[PDB]
Design a protein around this ligand. Structure first.
Ligand code: NAG
Ligand code: NAG
Ligand code: NAG
Ligand code: NAG
Ligand code: NAG
Ligand code: NAG
Ligand code: NAG
Ligand code: NAG
Ligand code: NAG
Lengths: 195, 183, 322
């Protein structure tokens, strides 16, 4: 199914496509501010040295130079913020690759939706694509349940499982599955009088 | 141009008090907010005109060319009055006398009708309104649908145990690094 | 709206601003991305479950009292009493003063839908438990959810049922004390006031910045056009436009930094909601000081409140060990 899914919708690889798009736009708009006067006579360098006389030639080329320095400063600041964001995202992949891949992680909704089973890393241009395998229950039936069972005047709490009944007999079962067993001492422990 | 003060705005009656020597009125940003008419003494409150953002609710160029202009954060009666020759900065004033005018908390969506059903939010208008392109085709705006209501039961004795499972796979795309660069 | 802020309503400043190039386009693109991130923050923090469950008709949850949290039918909004205080204490002519191109767009999710989401989250976890976060929700009597939440501590189940009432009385007294203590301290929700005060003072400083001369003869553009002939005037208006440009860039950069901070906080809040609430966490000092039991989300202006429950040993006695 996965093979098909990524082949059908074109909006899947949006995350990795946004980073390269942002970088391309930033570079393009950086190399595009070289044709703006910044409140000067012209944006051509040798021209602005040539016509204007020496006393105010500087009163113009300092304007140009500080404008381009401001543009570089803006680009650099944007890159420092974006790199911080990426590093925040990069450390969420090292932890996922450490826990989901090299083990079974019990953090809820961390290694995929549902109970986690394993994972499979895959490479991708300027990124990584995980592939989580999960255990999701689906069809359910509702029974009658009781907190405990008193038989010899003493309570009997379930060791591991829950007490359920199908209307005629009481059973002890697992939690995330349906497997009835006859209630025995190996499944119950006592905790005092049943009153 | 009160006493040599070239400014544009709306002049209305003001109840603010003036000290006998005081003439002008000022705010935090050094903007004149009151004047006294030289010919006749009176209190006038200068207030700037109406302004606001404009967006475009358009589907893809492939699908069609029907749009829906949203006038944000303005009292909706103005753009009726804005229907005139050379009395509005945007040139496409002809659209003002367009389709069904609708009112939202964020502005007026001129060019889309409001349906009363609920669906998933495709394009978010703002403050609980979402638009979409639907089929005889048009752009319709409606209220968001958080989801289908589900009513889980409850009692002093009721347990619901699953009897079957489905192993599923998912995906999680993550950036790891950006493009190296130098200058 | 640069044109309106940086330049006056006068047409002359517009051409000179256009000469500086795409300074402004970059800015709007920057402060739109911020808005989209702001919407996605609440979208991911609150909307983990897409099925809107409804509160049970009756409130007999095994002796426990969920009145202050569950929705209040009286008020049309389903805001409950603890939410009602939080909304009142936050308390958020200056807005009218923002005629200078500054606006505050409304959130996509209105307070009603946020309240409904917080009601669904808080109404699934009192009747289903941790299941509705993994797959199909399953109902289970509420006293019982608790004994499958003590078992994670390391203490057997034979405590919650054996002393069912006392735990109920302690929980009710605790929730009452929480409401009273939240009402008391002036700075319980302070941090939340600090966020809105930071935003408000940032906007106020940005408004006041245009009164500054910035080395020019005056701070009013129309008067400097009128009194000064255009060739010399362009110098002074260049000073003003550069100063206000630098101020706007500083504001945008500070907003970017603060948005990064808020994004980190929102990611932490999402992790807490998906770990403390939809399951029992075993991370020390994450979901409350002590052995964690469960949690309750509550809405608040520009933030969330968690009512972390915990179980703390009390009276100790010492012995001899082999
Ligand atoms: C299961 O739930 C349905 C709907 O709530 C109810 O009609 C039915 O009686 C329940 N089953 C049992 C065994 O109680
Ligand atoms: C309950 O399970 C027992 C186990 O064999 C079976 O004999 C009985 O018919 C079942 N009753 C119902 C109502 O399913
Ligand atoms: C000027 O106008 C004022 C206000 O109406 C009036 O009292 C005064 O007589 C006028 N004087 C002349 C010379 O018009
Ligand atoms: C429009 O259709 C053409 C031809 O199928 C396709 O190449 C293009 O990507 C489409 N664009 C959009 C926006 O749907
Ligand atoms: C516009 O003002 C009128 C007059 O008070 C009012 O009735 C109407 O609701 C207002 N509309 C908006 C969108 O504010
Ligand atoms: C059965 O559960 C309902 C649901 O709250 C409760 O009102 C009733 O008291 C319970 N029955 C007994 C015998 O406790
Ligand atoms: C459980 O679901 C699977 C999914 O197709 C199905 O094949 C199977 O028959 C169902 N029942 C059992 C007992 O596995
Ligand atoms: C819960 O507390 C409220 C307010 O103290 C009270 O009116 C209500 O009766 C209580 N309910 C229970 C079940 O204790
Ligand atoms: C530990 O127990 C002994 C007696 O069993 C007692 O003398 C001592 O004071 C206890 N420790 C402390 C810290 O009280």
């Amino acid at each position: 199914k996965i093979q098909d899914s990524l082949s059908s919708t074109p909006s899947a690889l949006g995350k990795l496509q946004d980073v390269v798009n942002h970088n391309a736009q930033a570079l393009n708009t950086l190399v595009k501010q070289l044709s703006s006067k910044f409140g000067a006579i012209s944006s051509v360098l040798n021209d602005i040295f040539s016509r204007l006389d020496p006393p105010e030639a500087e009163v113009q080329i300092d304007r140009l130079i500080t404008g381009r320095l401001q543009s570089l400063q803006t680009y650099v600041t944007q890159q420092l913020i974006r790199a911080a964001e990426i590093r925040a995202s990069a450390n969420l992949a090292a932890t996922k690759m450490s826990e989901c891949v090299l083990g079974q992680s019990k953090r809820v909704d961390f290694c995929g939706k549902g109970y986690h089973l394993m994972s499979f890393p895959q490479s991708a241009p300027h990124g990584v694509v995980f592939l989580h395998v999960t255990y999701v229950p689906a069809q359910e039936k509702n029974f009658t349940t009781a907190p405990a069972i008193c038989h010899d005047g003493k309570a009997h709490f379930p060791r591991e499982g829950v007490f359920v009944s199908n209307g005629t007999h009481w059973f002890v079962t697992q939690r995330n599955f349906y497997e009835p067993q006859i209630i025995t001492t190996d499944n119950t422990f006592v905790s005092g009088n049943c009153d | 141009n009160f006493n040599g003060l070239k400014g544009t705005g709306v002049l209305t009656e003001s109840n603010k008090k003036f000290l006998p020597f005081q003439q002008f009125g000022r705010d935090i940003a050094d903007t004149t907010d009151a004047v006294r008419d030289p010919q006749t003494l009176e209190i006038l409150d200068i207030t700037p005109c109406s302004f606001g953002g404009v967006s475009v609710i358009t589907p893809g160029t492939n699908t069609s060319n029907q749009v829906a202009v949203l006038y944000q954060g303005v009292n909706c009666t103005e753009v009726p009055v804005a229907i005139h020759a050379d009395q509005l900065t945007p040139t496409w004033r002809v659209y003002s006398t367009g389709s069904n005018v609708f009112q939202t908390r964020a502005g007026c969506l001129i060019g889309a009708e409001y349906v009363n059903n609920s669906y998933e939010c495709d394009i978010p208008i703002g403050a609980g309104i979402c638009a979409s392109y639907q089929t005889s085709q048009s752009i319709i705006a409606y209220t968001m649908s958080l989801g289908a209501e589900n009513s889980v039961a409850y009692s002093n004795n009721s347990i619901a145990i699953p009897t079957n499972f489905t192993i599923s796979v998912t995906t999680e795309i993550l950036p790891v690094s950006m493009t190296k660069t130098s200058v | 709206d640069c044109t309106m802020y940086i330049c006056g309503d006068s047409t002359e400043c517009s051409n000179l601003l256009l000469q500086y190039g795409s300074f402004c386009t970059q800015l709007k693109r920057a402060l739109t991305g911020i808005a989209v991130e702001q919407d996605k923050n609440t979208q991911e923090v609150f909307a983990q479950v897409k099925q809107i469950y409804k509160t049970p008709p009756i409130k007999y949850f095994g002796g426990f009292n969920f009145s202050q949290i569950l929705p209040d039918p009286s008020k049309p909004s389903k805001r409950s009493p603890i939410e009602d205080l939080l909304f009142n204490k936050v308390t958020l002519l200056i807005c009218a003063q923002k005629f200078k191109g500054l606006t505050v767009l409304p959130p996509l999710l209105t307070d009603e839908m946020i309240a409904q989401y917080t009601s669904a989250l808080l109404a699934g976890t009192i009747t289903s438990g941790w299941t509705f976060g993994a797959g199909p929700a399953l109902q289970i009597p509420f006293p019982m959810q608790m004994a499958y939440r003590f078992n994670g501590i390391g203490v057997t189940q034979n405590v919650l049922y054996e002393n069912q009432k006392l735990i109920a009385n302690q929980f009710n007294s605790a929730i009452g004390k929480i409401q009273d203590s939240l009402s008391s301290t002036p700075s319980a929700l302070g941090k939340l006031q600090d966020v809105v005060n930071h935003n408000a003072q940032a906007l106020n400083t940005l408004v006041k910045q245009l009164s500054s001369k910035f080395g020019a003869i005056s701070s009013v553009l129309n008067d400097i056009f009128s009194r000064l002939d255009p060739p010399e005037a362009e110098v002074q208006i260049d000073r003003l436009i550069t100063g206000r440009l630098q101020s706007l860039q500083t504001y945008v950069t500070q907003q970017l930094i603060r948005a990064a901070e808020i994004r980190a906080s929102a990611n932490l809040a999402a992790t807490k909601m998906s770990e403390c609430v939809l399951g029992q966490s075993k991370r020390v000092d994450f979901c409350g000081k002590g052995y964690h039991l469960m949690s309750f989300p509550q809405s608040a202006p520009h933030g969330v409140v968690f009512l972390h429950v915990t179980y703390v040993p009390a009276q100790e006695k010492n012995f001899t060990t082999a």
